[PDB]
Amino acid sequence: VDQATLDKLEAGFKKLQEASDCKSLLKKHLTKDVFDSIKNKKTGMGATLLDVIQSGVENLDSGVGIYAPDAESYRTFGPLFDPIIDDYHGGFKLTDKHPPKQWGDINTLVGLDPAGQFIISTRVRCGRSLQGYPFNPCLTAEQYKEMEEKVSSTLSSMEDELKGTYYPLTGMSKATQQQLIDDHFLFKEGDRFLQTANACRYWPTGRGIFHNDAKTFLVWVNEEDHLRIISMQKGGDLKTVYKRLVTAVDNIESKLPFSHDDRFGFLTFCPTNLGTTMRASVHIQLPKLAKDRKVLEDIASKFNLQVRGTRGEHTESEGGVYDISNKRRLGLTEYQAVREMQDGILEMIKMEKAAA
Ligand SMILES: Nc1ncnc2c1ncn2[C@@H]1O[C@H](COP(=O)(O)OP(=O)(O)O)[C@@H](O)[C@H]1O
Ligand SMILES: NC(=[NH2+])NCCC[C@H](N)C(=O)O
Ligand SMILES: [Mg+2]
Q1: 224 is in an annotated binding site
Q2: Which among 72, 189, 297, 313 is annotated as catalytic?
Q3: CATH 1.10.135.10 domain residues, the chain
Q4: Which residues form the Phosphagen kinase N-terminal domain?
C-alpha cells in the first residue's frame, strides 16, 4: 500500500482510539493487533483497509463503520470483518457457513395485526449484487450505466402483478423524487455514511427505481447495493408481502446472475446485509412501549429486532411510527429471518396491549 494511505490509516486508528464515546463495531473490533495484520494489505482491485474503514472513521456515530469495496475485501481484511460479522449477526464463527437459500413454508406466516390499530405498513426487502461488477467504491461511471441498462431491461420482462416501469433518477423531477421518498418508496439521497465510503460517485448516474403501478413491488437500482428487491403495502399482511417478494426474487434470479458466496451467502456492500440480505419490517405504533424509547429498544433487542425511524435508519420516529425489523441476516435462512420479525412483532403487540 502507498505510504499516504498508511499515514491516513494510522491517523484514522488514532481517531478511533481517541473517540472515547464511539460505540461502532469498527472501534470495538479494530484492535492494534488486527490493524497491524491488515493495514499493509491490498486487494486485486486495489482496495485497502482505508477503503474499508473510511466511513467509520469519518462518521464516528456509525453503528458498524465498515464496507467491502469488493468481494475479495471480505477475506483480505477478514481479521476485521469476521469478528464484526460475528458480533452484528448474533453469532457466526469462522467455521460457520451461511445455509442454502430457503424461503420456507409461507403458509405459516400470518397477518400481524388483524384489528389494525398498531401496524401501518409491512415491507420485506432483499439485496443482490451482479456477478462481474464490484461494489460501489470500485465502480466507474460507465459501469453504473451498464448495470442500469442490464437491470432495467431484465425488469421489463416482469409480468402480471410484477409488471412495471423503470424510472431513472437522472431526469426525475425534484418533486417526484421527493414524493417517492416521503411515501417511503424511493431510497434517500445524500447518505453521509455511504458518501464517505465513496459509494455515491457519479450520482445520480445509473441510479433509479422500478415499480409496478401499485407500488407494491419495487427495485432500487444502484443505491447501496446493485439491486434492492422490495415488496410492501399498507397493513400487516406479511404472508402476501413475503409471497410477492419470493415470487419476484425467484423470477429475477432466473434471468440475472447474482454473486453468491459459499460462506457469506449472497454478497452485499455492507456486512450487515450478507446471507439472506433480508430485512422484514413494519411501520408500527406502540405508544406505551415507545413512551421510554430505552425500553422499546431494550425489548426489541431481546427479539433480535432493530428499531429505526419513520424515514429509515439514522432518522427519528414521526407521529410515534417506528420501523421495527429483524436485525440478523446472516447465519439463518430467509424463513428464520422473516420469522424473527413476525414472532417479535406479535409479542410486542401483546405486550403493548397488556402494558399499563
Ligand atoms: N414497513 C415499512 N413500511 C413503509 N416504509 C418502510 C417500511 N420499512 C422501511 N420503510 C422505508 O424504506 C426506506 C429505506 O429505509 P432504510 O432504513 O434505508 O431500509 P433499507 O435500505 O434496508 O430498505 C425508507 O423510506 C423507509 O421509510
Ligand atoms: N448498511 C446499512 N444500510 N446500514 C447499516 C450500516 C450503516 C452505517 N454504515 C453504520 O451505522 O455503520
Ligand atoms: Mg437503506
Answers
A1: yes
A2: 313
A3: 1-94
A4: 8-90
Ligand positioned closest to the Cα atom of 313:
1
| Residue 126 marked as a ligand binder | no
Q: How far is 226 from 55, CA to CA, in rounded Å? A: 19
Instruction: Name the β-bridge partners of 322.
Output: 284
Resolution in Å equals 1.9
Experiment used for this model: X-ray
CATH code that applies to domain 97-356 = 3.30.590.10
**Which ligand has the minimum distance to the alpha carbon of residue 272?**
2
* 352: annotated active-site residue: no
Q: Given the residues 148, 223, 224, 352, select the one marked as catalytic.
A: 224
Which ranges in the chain belong to alpha helices (H)? 3-18, 25-29, 32-38, 49-58, 73-76, 78-88, 141-155, 174-182, 192-195, 238-253, 287-290, 293-302, 334-354
Residue 215 Cβ inside 6 Å of ligand 1? The answer reads: no
